[model samples]
Target chain A: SMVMEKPSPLLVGREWVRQYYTLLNQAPDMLHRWYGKNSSYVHGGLDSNGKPADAVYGQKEIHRKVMSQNFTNCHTKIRHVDAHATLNDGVVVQVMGLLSNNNQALRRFMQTFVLAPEGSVANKWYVHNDIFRYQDEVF
Target chain B: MVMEKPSPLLVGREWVRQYYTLLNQAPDMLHRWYGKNSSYVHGGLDSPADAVYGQKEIHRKVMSQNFTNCHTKIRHVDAHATLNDGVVVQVMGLLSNNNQALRRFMQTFVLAPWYVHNDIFRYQDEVF
Candidate 1:
């Protein structure tokens, strides 16, 4: 019988997020090129020159800056956890952060990850739904 | 210090599709009424109207079908054991099954409740 065991906590720790961030950031050029080709998939339409466009109307810039700031802050918090102990296995943690002055956006960005035992790397980390809760608002 | 106990079965079998069908029948209304109204708190010019519209739409549809449209078939799957003799349980189920294709929308539903006692009450109930 396939027995479902309690998940380990270490898989979703700072190290995991750091690894994900590193992997994501490592290929910025690829992402940029992909975005260039598929600019239509983006929120705004193509740019004036049609060369995949740069961040115009400040919407793209705003999202990029916010995401960058969020990652930076997340790294800082994860580092704090690392300072306490070596991130190992079987640990689950919730990450709380802010998005902007808008509380609704803030609630949407809150994330949770559960770390399972090592081996099946793909199934090691489980991300819950995007919905979250703050002091009063739940999103 | 006292440690909190985990429940064995959080939700019952019958309630599984009850929630999912409720979710599927009116996705937009459900999102606005439940998601936006309860979770998202940032209100703008149309927030109140959006919630009210969603609620009214849900009510209209549910009332039109005499509330039976929201009910669907559900099956219990698994349970989790906790340290406190209670269990935090989950039910794997499906929803919206009828002979007609229009009424059949099969989707997996997962439920996690805080207590098993509730599941025990409704587990074998025929009405469920």
Candidate 2:
């Protein structure tokens, strides 16, 4: 049954996401190794400043913006994760985490990462698609 | 004062609500919305093809998979954001299919930029 194949990848993906979150703030440099060279990241709609949320294309651009962005004081903690194996040898992992900054009220975020099915598992699993957003009530 | 600041955000927020509401409805409702070259990223579909480009293909996909007597409920409007281009929202919900098993799903929608604010330009489009 497909369910059997499901958990095998979940264990692999779940572990990766765990490490991904761990390295987010502590080792932004190391984060580059996790994504494939051509990954794309599209995020939230707009912010309080009226700046439209940006979409990062390619692994290089995604990495540049992510590491260079001013999340200096913020560190994320993975709260929950659910993974499912998709039809194309890929896995879509949904993540729930907290963005704790300067003791501000804990902000909750949910992200959906689509791990591409075409490549080798050893290359840290290529992230073909990434979309993240914060809960509305938080504002 | 608190409410006034988020007026724009609330406007976008309300717009998404209406978007999903109609989305949860029948498929023939596309003419009034969607872009001509609009593409839908239907990740993890049973089909090997991950995406369908253009409004025609999208309409077919919607009628076949989405509007095929399927009922959807917003179990949790978990999160949303106002992106630079359009709107992006993530919600975990329930889809009950008469002939299939009821399942929970987390869907992400990336609407187009202001030019076509109500139209969804790209979605589930993970081009890596």
Candidate 3:
């Protein structure tokens, strides 16, 4: 007689990474463009009248740049893991730990992203700024 | 600009003489055997004992007959619709009237088909 054992959560996690590799591969250029503009270091370039020149484009561009940076950073960490795995007898314990931490940080970042109905433009800009700040502080 | 209306539901029907034609085309011995022993009147065989004998052979025979009948019916209906669109319109009305009967038959006989959950009888035959 034979018995079946319960499936492991770790195995499920590894499978998820395998499936997500396709999406991750397509993300590099988009991520880079996003982070370049949205870093809190670059505030909305406003002039005397507070009547902004190309306000919407400026805000959106910044947001895309910041997001791109975050994505690039995540991709870099995963690449490090891959390199480490190949060198260290394919047993990437430390790299895996780092990846697990990054996953948790990403989950929290996604959960906090909010869009308010009334203050669409300003609120979105604020959120974009906050996200870049969070990424800098956490990772 | 005015938006075009979506196409109306196209229903069609036809009498299938090709069923009898295909039945005539089969080997005389096989046709005779099916006529006597096969449960064409009912959806499946009457006895579980009969279902137990050479499972793959039984499946192949039944599946072949099912495909032939289905193909003949579809072809007949398609030809009828292409020749006379008015007949298709009448079929839509008749189908609407018979919807309850059709739904009931499909629910019991087609969608929720009967199957042997455990192949206890065929286990010895199947064990590799």
Candidate 4:
């Protein structure tokens, strides 16, 4: 009989990253579904000098901000996805990638997420914290 | 002017420096910074099916890495104070072996009682 081994944090976390980006590109309006009442996401960009620009936060505000963006024609090229387990049975995932939209320049981006298990299922996780930054320019 | 306490970013930046220095210099003693409930997961270009649990096993794993003469240069650090005086940290950086070419890396940490309770480390050029 084959051994049934449990999934590692990296495996689970990478899957979450993939699904998150898939939703971001295909159904961005539904991105907010991954967040709960207390969840927060920071949207910021970095300049050539590595200085961080103003950040946007709050779940509702983040939802509105995401909805304002045009992701339907965007494509995400992920370069790396890393994950670690959390004390509360959550997972922290880090992604380094690039994004290209229709006729737009490719933009490098980095994102970190803290995903907590939804209800009782380990694989079914929700975004509890999110930090996203683009490396192209200070926006 | 009101006295300004150290921000989470400031504190975390310094802590990361010390943490990496120790990892490069004396990984055998790195276990002192991990709590009893500590957990660690490895990441790379492929799925790592196993993770180290508990302080003792985590210590062993850290030792087994055999990452001697590795220097870490952090590019960005994000830190936040969470519930119960805990801290969450995310770091993106480059690691060079024996002062060689730099490779992209990422790490996350959950800290409590000033100890690392959760740690995940991964190198770039990897996927799920």
Candidate 5:
């Protein structure tokens, strides 16, 4: 089902963002399917003394780090999604959303994703890089 | 005397910080850093429909923001050099709007010729 027309970054990106967060909040373990060996994930605001945290490499570490958040009871509402086409047929996306857990006060977050095409398929994308950070303190 | 170009990471990091500072202090002058074909999308707007094209329109849209009492505390920035000799930068930070409480923000930029070719900004807040 390969079409000649170029994929719209906004439309294609929005769809991917929707599914990405669904796996994040519902089943984090399955999220690894979107990552490859060269993938890297960076979770920010983890500083104890107001310093920045380091990037987590490898799919296993990414999965381990994501599962530690324990989002089984959390829900995310995507407020905005923006994307731009990059070189090498990749897409860069930025997302802003609110997250709530167990009817608790909503927490906001910002996440960026770099989706690179896999193999020879132009539409089959994998996460090349992901940067996630909470906007405010969650109590 | 000719000078060697700085590393992409170093140049991008410095430019990102300077750009954010300019955004808060003197947003009107930001248009000078954008090329003629530059594009920008900000606030709660979605893309690619909401993107503002051209330097003139981008400047007008950017100047419309409330910069009088806005400030940004940049937490982290990741930069990489692209094959086109441009830089791709991602910034994670907190923004204070009109002296209100601090809210999270994420911005991405594609820069070349020390000019902004593409930019996107979003604040982590409630939206309808």
Candidate 6:
């Protein structure tokens, strides 16, 4: 029998946001831990309009680009997070705040993620889909 | 050896902006989406306040609230998303009247396949 399990409550809360930031601070290569194999990651920002690099779909590609992201070297100042109970077999969260890289700051940072399990482990987590956005420009 | 289903598409910018006007015109009931055990978490245009719960009470509060004589106008919905059973819409807009200090806004709505509940963010007194 294929019974759908509950999403990781631990991974869907406020603390998860901190670990997400910590990943960029310590290990971007391992960011793949949060994504499903076919997931899509879209980068929306101040100038993402029609940009070729704005969107990437599929885990292999997603893994490459995200691992090279600048946030890997920067820091996130958490501002607000809205977590929800599971919906449509998944949990969605919206996080917003300030991202500081060196002395520069991105005023509005907002991202929405739909997290689901890959079915590999009880506590394993994967982002089924995500809309990631930041207010700062690409350097 | 497995593939995840794709996220659904329910994002429409122009259609989203039309919604505030829907509320202003009283075209719908807030509880159409609220259920018996439903809960709502929201703070915006008003205050970062207590969550309102229950369908009956939800409807009660909806019918009891006042609209902006300031004439509210909502901006585009960005990062509008659909997960398993509902959609989440996020935006930074202003619900204000001219000359009146703009009530800053950053609103996010989490709805079921049915729709609605949220926390409103008054971002900066203006929607840029």
Pairs with steric clashes in candidate 2: A45-B81, A45-B82, A45-B83, A46-B82, A46-B83, A52-B84, A53-B83, A53-B84, B85-B113
Local lDDT at B126 for model 1? 17
Kindly report which residue stretches of model 4 are placed more than 4 angstroms away from their true locations once superposed: A1-15, A47-50, A78-84, A103-109, A117-125, A134-139, B1-6, B41-50, B82-85, B125-128
Docking category of candidate 2: incorrect
Each model's DockQ? 0.03, 0.06, 0.01, 0.28, 0.29, 0.22
Model 6 C-alpha lDDT per residue in residues B25-83, reported as the tens digit of each score:
66346566566545554344443343466777766665555544445555435443445
The order by descending DockQ is 5, 4, 6, 2, 1, 3
| Candidate 4 C-alpha error for residue A55, in Å | 3.7
Q: Chain B TM-score for each model?
A: 0.27, 0.59, 0.19, 0.85, 0.86, 0.61
> Judged by TM-score relative to the true structure, which candidate is superior, 1 or 4?
4
CA error at residue B59 for candidate 6, angstroms: 2.7
Give the deviation of candidate 6 from the true structure as CA RMSD: 7.0
Per-residue lDDT of candidate 5, residues A1-139 (tens digit) = 7658767887778989889877766777898778877677876555686655666767888888777766666688888788877555667788878777666877777777877788767559888778776666321
Candidate 2 vs candidate 5, TM-score winner: 5
Can you write out model 4's per-residue Cα lDDT over B1-110, one digit (the tens) per residue? 88786666666787798888898888899888877667786553332435677888988888667777887778778776543456677777888766577877667777
Candidate 6 off by > 4 Å: A1-11, A46-53, A135-139, B1-15, B36-39, B44-47, B61-65, B70-76, B79-82, B97-100, B111-114, B117-128
Leading candidate by TM-score: 4
Candidate 6: tens digits of C-alpha lDDT, residues A44-122: 5444473324556677888887755555356677766756544544555667677765456555666666666567677
* Interface root-mean-square deviation (Å) of every model: 15.7, 11.4, 29.7, 4.2, 4.0, 5.8
lDDT of 4: 0.72
TM-score of chain A of each: 0.29, 0.74, 0.22, 0.80, 0.84, 0.74
Better of 2 and 4 by TM-score: 4
* lDDT, model 5: 0.74
lDDT of 5 by residue, B9-77 (tens): 687789888987887788899888877667787765443237787889998888777676767787767
